[PDB]
Amino acid sequence: VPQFHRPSTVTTDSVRALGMRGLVLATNNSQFIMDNNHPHPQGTQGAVREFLRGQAAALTDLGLAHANNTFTPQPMFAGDAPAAWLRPAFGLRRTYSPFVV
Amino acid sequence: VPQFHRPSTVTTDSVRALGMRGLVLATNNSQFIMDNNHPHPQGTQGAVREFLRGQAAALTDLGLAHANNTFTPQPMFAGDAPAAWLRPAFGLRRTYSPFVV
Amino acid sequence: AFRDARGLELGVGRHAMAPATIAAVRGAFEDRNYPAVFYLLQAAIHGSEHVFCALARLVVQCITSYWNNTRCAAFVNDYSLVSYVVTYLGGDLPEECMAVYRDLVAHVEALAQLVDDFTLTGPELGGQAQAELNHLMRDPALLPPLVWDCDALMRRAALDRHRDCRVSAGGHDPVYAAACNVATADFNRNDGQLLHNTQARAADAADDRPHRGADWTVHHKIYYYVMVPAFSRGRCCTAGVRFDRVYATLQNMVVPEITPGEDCPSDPVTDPAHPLHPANLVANTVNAMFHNGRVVVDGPAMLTLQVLAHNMAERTTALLCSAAPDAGANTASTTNMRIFDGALHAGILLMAPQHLDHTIQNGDYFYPLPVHALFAGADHVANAPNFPPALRDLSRQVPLVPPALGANYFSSIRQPVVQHVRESAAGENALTYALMAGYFKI
Amino acid sequence: AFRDARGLELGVGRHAMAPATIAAVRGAFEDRNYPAVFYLLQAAIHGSEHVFCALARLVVQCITSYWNNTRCAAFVNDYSLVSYVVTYLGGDLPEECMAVYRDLVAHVEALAQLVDDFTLTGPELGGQAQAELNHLMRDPALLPPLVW
Amino acid sequence: TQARAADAADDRPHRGADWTVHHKIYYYVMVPAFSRGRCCTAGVRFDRV
Amino acid sequence: AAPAGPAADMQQLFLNAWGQRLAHGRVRWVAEGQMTPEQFMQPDNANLA
Amino acid sequence: YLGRGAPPLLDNAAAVYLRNAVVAGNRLGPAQPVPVFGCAQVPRRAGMD
Structure with missing residues (x-):
């Protein structure tokens, strides 16, 4: 459980266990007086580093929450195809609307 | 109960207890001959002051009558956010249409 | 007026920018209520192909939402972003909004053919071809002011030793x-x-x-x-x-x-x-x-932003670079004197001053830096805290470029190119030829 | 007739103003029956940040109605509101009306740099700028006629 | 005219010295040009407003 | 100058170093820009030499 | 400025700022600033046309 007024509390597994629907709401409901009694082991340097690493894992889980709704993504560019000696490699110019009913 | 032909009658609690739907209608149904037998303790100076202080409290109650219909307002500007050291503060440019079914 | 006639001397009709397409660009640098979402993406893509072709459904929905508003171009900041919309984004933008972007890439290439007319053909000089030794903008002694890569550095590092090549990077x-x-x-x-x-x-x-x-x-x-x-x-x-x-x-x-x-x-x-x-x-x-800037984005297009996890970057670094005059001009009289050019790395050019939006504090995102005397904010250098009060008198009259990025007697473009811009009367189609005929070396 | 030549002497092309804006603003000061709600609003905003950003949707719905009305700009008498509409109110207003407000604020800023092209840089004079001893509109000896 | 309620300044003026230069050039140059005279200023009775 | 320290705080460290030196005299190269081409030939500048 | 009769303006920061910027480098301007009683001098031109 993260406590955003204490910099030593924030870890990646504490951020990732909280949903991104509730991640913003937990930040908006804390106090704004920073406690200096609980310092992060890297200070304010690594605490910002630690907070960014928790969000990126959560949004990949957010895409998995909509994985039934999205199509399987194809490679964007050429040069990446199994049958490359009989067929040229394409990329998809991602302009369509991925949606699955 | 306010009597708008008598300046000593108008108080904030007399105005606020009357609804703003009936506040205008009570003013439109009085007589227009001012009685000088009932002077306000500040005269016509504080009676206008007293009347304005009653309307502002009633309209906050009018917003509470539509509080089920409106969304929760966010801060308009930056500089006011709890998690301010890891996340910047935004304001909402209030252009949307607050309505709750 | 002599330089502007010189711009008309090359304005015989090599290429002209369409006059209905000029006003979309002038409004873009005039924009207030210009949403900072686009600025955030201009830091987010970095010019990466992998990030651009991933965010293509966002950017098309960003431009179409913006072109339906302003009749003004979007992503005018980064030139890498401009050409990518021209090349790798097809006709899924509207019929008129593409034609603005068609002109700019054509107009940049039109300036490139000025040089090959005015260079005689012949052999190389040590250590580069002599069609490059006339127009300064083709020489690798210059750098672009905002470089996302090390490409211009690596083209420069192949240059020979007895013309100096030292490029400092934050004191390293x-x-x-x-x-x-x-x-x-x-x-x-x-x-x-x-x-x-x-x-x-x-x-x-x-x-x-x-x-x-x-x-x-x-x-x-x-x-x-x-x-x-x-x-x-x-x-x-x-x-x-x-x-x-x-x-x-x-x-x-x-x-x-x-x-x-x-x-x-x-x-x-x-x-x-x-x-x-x-x-x-x-x-x-x-x-x-997004709603701060009136941008309409579809639902599942929002989940395409996850590519910003992988391709990330760090700080904007100041890059002094040092070269001493290019070949054919090296004489025993002139070896010791140097030419210094400032260039930020992975930076953003601010296309308009913005002060009155108190929905974003000054310094939440962007740390403004005047690289060159061409690029000096008359407004948003003065109002970026902390600024001393005795200087906003003098800040409007002269630029405030620090010599940590080069000064106005050493930098390869001196001051009076900047003053020629402000005293221009010939319009946009004549100035672009007029500067190119200025940038030729003596 | 002599001063208009001086007025034309600076109209070499430093800045131009669109004729579609002029016929809108000339209407707006000549609008009889300009609706007095707007006069009641201009007292009520105070030209203030906290009020204009709060009442921002009302200012949109008034102007869009007034733009579908007489085709004149609104709130033209107060400069404070006009710069607030430019810098805050985005794509809600139809941008044939917004281009009027573009050609007002940018027109004001082009006037301010007339002075700086006609001043010689250097030292202060106790205790003001020497770019300030030329143009009366820069002196704090003057005040604006309506100060909020 | 404050960007937020937490400022409440007296000895600090709000937004810098260019802001008053913009207002003066509007009222004394722009305004009399358009309206051809014909304007006036009015003391507003804030009681009834 | 050589670029000292991180560039994230470069310009704010700059103006505090040069807050006096900017305003003691007039910058040479800017004031030549407003010279008429006949006025520049005159001895008013004393920078022709 | 050869005339010496008219009273100057008050601030010596400003009154000297004109006198440097008018005399230098004018042809007829005084070389040494004007004596207290006597007639000031015009500098000798090196050659006449």
């Missing part, structure tokens, strides 16, 4: 890095580590070969030093970007789960399941950030 010599990650980033490093993140695909990961060849740097140089001062009329400078909070904004996401028997939410107003719906507008979210 430059060291390269192939790519960054989420766990790699480590923003506040002070060393000479620079970044090479913009690639075609992740399968390449090269360091010592430059990505796409040497003309690609020339197109960037022609845009920022000819096109940009002509349209903007001064008024625009560059900025370093705090990558702390730019990534920290954009990963805030609110997208509700959809009933399987329901279609995709399209209307931004009436749909409650829409991401930009006012029920999903929470402060400090990115859904709040």
